[PDB]
Design a protein around this motif. Sequence first.
Motif, mmCIF file in Angstrom:
data_model
loop_
_atom_site.group_PDB
_atom_site.id
_atom_site.type_symbol
_atom_site.label_atom_id
_atom_site.label_comp_id
_atom_site.label_asym_id
_atom_site.label_seq_id
_atom_site.Cartn_x
_atom_site.Cartn_y
_atom_site.Cartn_z
ATOM 1 N N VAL A 96 0.844 -1.187 0.000
ATOM 2 C CA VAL A 96 0.000 0.000 0.000
ATOM 3 C C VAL A 96 0.882 1.241 0.000
ATOM 4 O O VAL A 96 2.012 1.196 0.502
ATOM 5 N N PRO A 97 0.425 2.353 -0.557
ATOM 6 C CA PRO A 97 1.246 3.565 -0.549
ATOM 7 C C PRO A 97 1.329 4.247 0.804
ATOM 8 O O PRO A 97 0.810 3.747 1.805
ATOM 9 N N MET A 98 1.984 5.409 0.824
ATOM 10 C CA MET A 98 2.326 6.044 2.097
ATOM 11 C C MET A 98 1.131 6.625 2.853
ATOM 12 O O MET A 98 0.979 6.287 4.040
ATOM 13 N N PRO A 99 0.268 7.490 2.280
ATOM 14 C CA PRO A 99 -0.785 8.077 3.125
ATOM 15 C C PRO A 99 -1.863 7.089 3.522
ATOM 16 O O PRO A 99 -2.479 7.255 4.584
ATOM 17 N N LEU A 100 -2.090 6.055 2.713
ATOM 18 C CA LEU A 100 -2.990 4.987 3.124
ATOM 19 C C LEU A 100 -2.431 4.232 4.321
ATOM 20 O O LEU A 100 -3.170 3.899 5.254
ATOM 21 N N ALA A 101 -1.121 3.984 4.324
ATOM 22 C CA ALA A 101 -0.494 3.333 5.466
ATOM 23 C C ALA A 101 -0.458 4.246 6.681
ATOM 24 O O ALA A 101 -0.410 3.762 7.816
ATOM 25 N N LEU A 102 -0.469 5.560 6.465
ATOM 26 C CA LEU A 102 -0.589 6.486 7.584
ATOM 27 C C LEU A 102 -1.973 6.407 8.207
ATOM 28 O O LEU A 102 -2.113 6.251 9.427
ATOM 29 N N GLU A 103 -3.011 6.500 7.372
ATOM 30 C CA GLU A 103 -4.375 6.535 7.882
ATOM 31 C C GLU A 103 -4.807 5.200 8.467
ATOM 32 O O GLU A 103 -5.561 5.174 9.446
ATOM 33 N N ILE A 104 -4.315 4.088 7.913
ATOM 34 C CA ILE A 104 -4.735 2.770 8.370
ATOM 35 C C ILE A 104 -4.163 2.416 9.737
ATOM 36 O O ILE A 104 -4.627 1.463 10.370
ATOM 37 N N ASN A 105 -3.174 3.164 10.224
ATOM 38 C CA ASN A 105 -2.751 3.044 11.607
ATOM 39 C C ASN A 105 -3.226 4.197 12.469
ATOM 40 O O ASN A 105 -3.366 4.019 13.684
ATOM 41 N N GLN A 106 -3.488 5.359 11.869
ATOM 42 C CA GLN A 106 -4.045 6.474 12.621
ATOM 43 C C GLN A 106 -5.439 6.146 13.131
ATOM 44 O O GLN A 106 -5.753 6.372 14.306
ATOM 45 N N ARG A 107 -6.281 5.577 12.265
ATOM 46 C CA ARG A 107 -7.614 5.174 12.695
ATOM 47 C C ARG A 107 -7.552 4.012 13.675
ATOM 48 O O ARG A 107 -8.402 3.914 14.566
ATOM 49 N N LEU A 108 -6.532 3.161 13.550
ATOM 50 C CA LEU A 108 -6.312 2.088 14.516
ATOM 51 C C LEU A 108 -6.025 2.643 15.901
ATOM 52 O O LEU A 108 -6.631 2.223 16.896
ATOM 53 N N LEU A 109 -5.114 3.611 15.982
ATOM 54 C CA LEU A 109 -4.747 4.158 17.279
ATOM 55 C C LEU A 109 -5.863 5.015 17.864
ATOM 56 O O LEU A 109 -6.041 5.045 19.088
ATOM 57 N N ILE A 110 -6.651 5.677 17.017
ATOM 58 C CA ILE A 110 -7.768 6.462 17.529
ATOM 59 C C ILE A 110 -8.873 5.551 18.052
ATOM 60 O O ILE A 110 -9.438 5.798 19.125
ATOM 61 N N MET A 111 -9.161 4.457 17.341
ATOM 62 C CA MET A 111 -10.110 3.477 17.854
ATOM 63 C C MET A 111 -9.600 2.768 19.098
ATOM 64 O O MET A 111 -10.406 2.269 19.887
ATOM 65 N N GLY A 112 -8.284 2.701 19.288
ATOM 66 C CA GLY A 112 -7.774 2.228 20.561
ATOM 67 C C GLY A 112 -8.009 3.227 21.678
ATOM 68 O O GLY A 112 -8.491 2.870 22.756
ATOM 69 N N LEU A 113 -7.682 4.496 21.428
ATOM 70 C CA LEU A 113 -7.686 5.491 22.496
ATOM 71 C C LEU A 113 -9.097 5.878 22.914
ATOM 72 O O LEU A 113 -9.330 6.225 24.076
ATOM 73 N N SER A 161 14.413 21.237 20.156
ATOM 74 C CA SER A 161 15.102 19.995 19.832
ATOM 75 C C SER A 161 14.449 18.814 20.527
ATOM 76 O O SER A 161 14.125 17.806 19.883
ATOM 77 N N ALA A 162 14.200 18.942 21.828
ATOM 78 C CA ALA A 162 13.552 17.854 22.542
ATOM 79 C C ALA A 162 12.103 17.695 22.106
ATOM 80 O O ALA A 162 11.569 16.581 22.127
ATOM 81 N N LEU A 163 11.474 18.780 21.652
ATOM 82 C CA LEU A 163 10.139 18.690 21.088
ATOM 83 C C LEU A 163 10.154 17.964 19.756
ATOM 84 O O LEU A 163 9.196 17.262 19.433
ATOM 85 N N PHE A 164 11.224 18.112 18.979
ATOM 86 C CA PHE A 164 11.352 17.324 17.761
ATOM 87 C C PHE A 164 11.531 15.852 18.082
ATOM 88 O O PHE A 164 10.983 14.999 17.376
ATOM 89 N N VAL A 165 12.277 15.545 19.147
ATOM 90 C CA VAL A 165 12.422 14.153 19.579
ATOM 91 C C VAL A 165 11.080 13.576 20.017
ATOM 92 O O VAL A 165 10.735 12.443 19.665
ATOM 93 N N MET A 166 10.290 14.357 20.756
ATOM 94 C CA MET A 166 8.972 13.887 21.182
ATOM 95 C C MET A 166 8.012 13.759 20.010
ATOM 96 O O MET A 166 7.167 12.858 19.988
ATOM 97 N N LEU A 167 8.123 14.644 19.024
ATOM 98 C CA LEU A 167 7.262 14.543 17.853
ATOM 99 C C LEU A 167 7.636 13.343 17.001
ATOM 100 O O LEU A 167 6.762 12.678 16.448
ATOM 101 N N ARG A 168 8.925 13.020 16.923
ATOM 102 C CA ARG A 168 9.339 11.818 16.211
ATOM 103 C C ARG A 168 8.917 10.567 16.976
ATOM 104 O O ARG A 168 8.542 9.550 16.374
ATOM 105 N N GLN A 169 8.942 10.653 18.305
ATOM 106 C CA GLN A 169 8.542 9.550 19.164
ATOM 107 C C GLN A 169 7.036 9.325 19.115
ATOM 108 O O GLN A 169 6.551 8.217 19.371
ATOM 109 N N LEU A 170 6.271 10.372 18.833
ATOM 110 C CA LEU A 170 4.869 10.152 18.512
ATOM 111 C C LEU A 170 4.714 9.678 17.072
ATOM 112 O O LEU A 170 3.818 8.883 16.772
ATOM 113 N N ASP A 171 5.610 10.119 16.186
ATOM 114 C CA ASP A 171 5.451 9.896 14.755
ATOM 115 C C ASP A 171 5.652 8.442 14.369
ATOM 116 O O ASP A 171 4.922 7.926 13.515
#
Lengths: 295, 196, 147, 147, 48, 49, 49, 143, 147, 48, 97, 49, 49
Positions: A138-155, A258-268
């Motif tokens: 699957v391409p990139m934004p589909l793979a983004l959304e198919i886990n974003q909706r997964l994590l939102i349905m988890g939370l 810088s540490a906010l970029f680390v946290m954003l990557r850690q969320l990413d």
Amino acid sequence: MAAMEANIFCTFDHKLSIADVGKLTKLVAAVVPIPQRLHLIKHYQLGLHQFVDHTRGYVRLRGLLRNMTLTLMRRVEGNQILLHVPTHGLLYTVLNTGPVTWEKGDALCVLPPLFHGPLARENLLTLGQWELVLPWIVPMPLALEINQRLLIMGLFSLDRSYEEVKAAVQQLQTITFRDATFTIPDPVIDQHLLIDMKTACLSMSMVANLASELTMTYVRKLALEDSSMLLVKCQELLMRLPARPQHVSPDDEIARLSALFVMLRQLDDLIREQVVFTVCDVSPDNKSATCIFKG
Amino acid sequence: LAEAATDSILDNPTTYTTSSGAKISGVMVSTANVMQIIMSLLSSHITKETVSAPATYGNFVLSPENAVTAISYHSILADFNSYKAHLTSGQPHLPNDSLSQAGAHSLTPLSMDVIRLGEKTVIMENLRRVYKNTDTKDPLERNVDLTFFFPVGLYLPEDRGYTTVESKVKLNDTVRNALPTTAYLLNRDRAVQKID
Amino acid sequence: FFFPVGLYLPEDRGYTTVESKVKLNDTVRNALPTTAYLLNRDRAVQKIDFVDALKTLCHPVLHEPAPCLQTFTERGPPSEPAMQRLLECRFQQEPMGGAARRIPHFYRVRREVPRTVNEMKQDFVVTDFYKVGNITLYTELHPFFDF
Amino acid sequence: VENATLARQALNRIQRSNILQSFKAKMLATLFLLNRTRDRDYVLKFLTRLAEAATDSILDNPTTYTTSSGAKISGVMVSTANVMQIIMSLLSSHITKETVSAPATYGNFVLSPENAVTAISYHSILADFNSYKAHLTSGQPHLPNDS
Amino acid sequence: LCTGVIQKLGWCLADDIHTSFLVHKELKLSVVRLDNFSVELGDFREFV
Amino acid sequence: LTPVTMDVNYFKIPNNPRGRASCMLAVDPYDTEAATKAIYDHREADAQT
Amino acid sequence: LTCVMRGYLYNTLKTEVFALMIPKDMYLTWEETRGRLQYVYLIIVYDYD
Amino acid sequence: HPGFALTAVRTDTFEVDMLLYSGKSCTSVIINNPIVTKEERDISTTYHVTQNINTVDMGLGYTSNTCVAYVNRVRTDMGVRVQDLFRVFPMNVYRHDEVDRWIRHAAGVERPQETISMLTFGSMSERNAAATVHGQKAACELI
Amino acid sequence: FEAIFGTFCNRLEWVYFLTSGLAAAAHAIKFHDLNKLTTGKMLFHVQVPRVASGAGLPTSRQTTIMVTKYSEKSPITIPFELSAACLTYLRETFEGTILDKILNVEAMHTVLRALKNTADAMERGLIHSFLQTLLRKAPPYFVVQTL
Amino acid sequence: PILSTTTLALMETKLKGGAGAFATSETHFGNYVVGEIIPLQQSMLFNS
Amino acid sequence: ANKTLFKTIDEYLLRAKDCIRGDTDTQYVCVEGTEQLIENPCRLTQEALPILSTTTLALMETKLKGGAGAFATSETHFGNYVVGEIIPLQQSMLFNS
Amino acid sequence: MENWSALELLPKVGIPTDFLTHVKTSAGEEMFEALRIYYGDDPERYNIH
Amino acid sequence: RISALPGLNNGQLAEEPLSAYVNALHDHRLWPPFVTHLPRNMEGVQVVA
């Protein structure tokens, strides 16, 4: 140790009917997963049917699929499948299997299939209590959304009623990505989604603590004089409730950012699992695409 | 074991015959220990006589009349011109199968060990020398499971009690000798094992 | 070669498999073993008793558990955390004159004493005591002492 | 030789267990062979197992130690005359007062001069140095025989 | 920032890994020896 | 020894009179901890009995 | 020094395969059963005590 | 003796060298030529060589008879050491703790001390002994 | 001295399929395109003979049995490998002294030795796969004697 | 284990029995005989 | 798993056998195909075999005092009992060596 | 300690080897004194100094 | 005396003694059918008329 065989022969023990060899000849230069990495593997380990359980935990399937070695089909003949685990960097063509239209310049990721079952009626090499299961490219934004909706349905499914859950799955199972509607087979909360939720909530709590005195009031100062559909569409998901900046200290702001970029990557990295193919040029009927980054 | 198995369906009577005119029923293989035991046992039937073996492997090449069948219909019918000839001439019986016809042309001698089993001669052979110093396991060695079961702590009906071993053994009247609680098994040596 | 002398078969598991052959008068000297009869280099009935073992039974090293105590104390408590229940003693020393009025004062607590080890070696039957289900087998070291 | 067909690497626990089982079986059962059993078939089977169980040599002696009619000598069983007086009297259908060919000379074996040079210089000896030196520079990697 | 940082060093054969030592100035230091190691460097990827 | 030693398995077969089966060959070789675990410790089973 | 950037480690004429050495203290495995392959990673973990 | 008698089943693996008798040309095995394939790298060039074969039977009935001939050893102990349910049910506890913390010290079993990697295949839950003279063991129960 | 009396390589018994007597259980035919066939089926049109019945009996009728047999697939392989230094010294000879010709000859010999050992392993594996396919076909003695 | 006998009478009925009488292990109430696992007291010194 | 009597034995030959890990102390189920499978005639008949489980050492030393063939006999006292082993496995096999 | 390269370079003789047990077992149980058991193709026999 | 096992019982698992588990003739749950005085311990027991 003997080296990892780049020429992996798959064998077959079932009596292959002629339509089965015909359908096996369709899948030349496609992706199949295999965990063994021997030279003369059987057919049971090939594919993904070794890991399909009664749970139908799609998050569990995504968790196990990342560890499986991806290879390419080549030179199908009588009882022989020559597989090629590709070395990193070079290029060779792959073929789609699902109805997912691609582009040029984007990236591709590996994924277990959507609405998997007898709904699209896949007769993909069915023999003797075993089916050939294909991971989706699957391409990139589909793979983004198919886990974003997964994590939102988890939370969302914590501390709330079950009718909210049954009204929330149907709001978050459809994906209208690129002229096609997909449905996710049974998003179910398990311990893996729990530990992913724990990592996500800890990272966003730490970045909420990490926010400086200016980056949380940037939209609050911006929305007095600016007018844009972007700013209006992002403002209404916030609550309701010249001036001076408190203290400009950019020596601290470099460290905070810088540490906010680390946290954003850690969320990413919860939704950006792996780029496995970069598509260069497609076929015009989109049955295949020459792509790079194989392996 | 010899008469119990049936024969084959293709017959190559020219190959695998013993010198001075003897036909070979079949091959009987085991390990070197068992065949050593048999040869020391049935030494009135061992004969080290020469067997006319095939020289090289067979040959089963196709036909141009089979090639278009392999392309179009994804099938091979062996001796396709022979089948079409026997159809067009109308004969029911093809003279020979296409597998016994396939190869095994020449013959080379070799001396093996054969034995008489009720005028059905068979080949003695052990595969010790092919698994001599390898890394695999000889499949003629095997493991067989037997499930054993045994009771302990039962109660016989004392209302219909009896003894058959009274003239050999005797017990003193105590309740632990009156009621079984334990049992006594063996080890893989002759060792009494206490189980309660 | 090795052989036992003076053992004790259990009475509740007693039996006779030689009834027709032997018949012994029922005095206690035949009902308890104290001898052992072997055969010599010649086929001759020799005899060993406890009397002739006096060159071993009465040695002063047999009654000295001090190297036994040293070897017992160098490997100290059992490191098994499942058996932290038997190594509890409070062996104090107090005067005895006030004890005759402190004896209703001792039970003014309502907390029990832990179980002593020598008590714990007595609630096993004759035949399970050699099994691993006993905890106190690291305490039994010598037939003349308590460790 | 009973376990030579089973094991194929370094031994695990179960193989060494079976090895010790058959050790304590055979060392106990066959401690004194001829002092216990005196039947032809069993002692013949025992001597047959003893004769096959040993591995052979490496040197080819194709013609020496050979009887008439080409029967090659495989082994030699030495003992005292007291045992042989029971062996030959019990197994008398298998003895043949036959004459064998024996090497009438010792094995004379000399040192090469370049072996003496290596002996002085490097404290070592490579036997048949001329043959090794020829077959090295020649090309064939298999000699006819050792030294 | 960056509690743990992990970079990919390379890859090995998972069977030649054995314990050895290096001696230098008669100082024996017990090491782990990876016999057939192929170096494939990566950037210091950081996590929490 | 104790007078309650079960004679039928400790005095009728070839047995090690030490108390345990102290056969070192049953131990995997060059392992010193497992050896004292097999011949000295007592919170486990014993070989041959 | 001649460092090796990408690929195997070998001598000139490939007669000797050099081996990567790591000291015992830094070594760390998280599985008792290693696979057919295992990658190697360099882990720096900070103690913010 | 309580009011019920239990029985015990167990299996035993014996080693056996079987003997196989088969008829003359009971099957016709076909091979092809050995197919070499290369796999070239920096440090070595392994050559794999495959050989697809096929066997077709040449009988209607059972053409070949095997049998069990000789037994060399008992690879088990034929012992009485029963197999514990506290290993093959490694997560069952009591609803009350202080009866559970008494039963484990009565049976001698280790605490419940991994769960995701247990129901798929399992693990070495009960370890080996430090040594054994009698090989492997198995004994189960039937109340 | 450090007298080396000889260097000893191990020679191999190049067993073949047809050299073994187990080839009489088989019927070996080389098919040149076996990796292109899917399956090999065999069919039999068997009719059985009736008998004429007596008076007052339910007689039989004509019969036809069309039974079918099939094939099997079981490939084998050997991963024999070669060091790159061997391939370097196989075809290269720079500054052609004795000491480089020795390495060239040894490279040629380890190549041909690996080839011979590979072919021997292929023959042993073909015998082994034949025995494997036989042992999954042979029923035990009791069922055959019963039938 | 060597042939040991508690009482006189059990040794007497051991000696009265024929060949292989040492092989068994008779057991009275409080008396017991352990039998030799190898008949090296039976037919060694008699065999000479 | 009940089928035709020729298919049941073929099912017995192919897949109805089970495996046993053969390098550890307790009987573990091995990984399939790595070591060879293990035949089991008890899977065919669905019985099990009895062995010499006597009650007491009174009735155990009698069988040990007895010579050949004693282990195939099943004796019974009042409360005690011996079950005789049907196949002579513990009588002659371990004394062959 | 033992020049194992001279074993692999010097021309040998050809003998029918008959070990008692399996040869890997006799190697792994250390009947012989000095061993050089390995796998694959060592290029150790080439760097002659 | 014989309904308990005085060679075994002491201590406790719950607040109830160890001898309360070995037989029903040593615990407060089993009442005699003609009770004239209420027992000392009625923790789990709730009497109801």
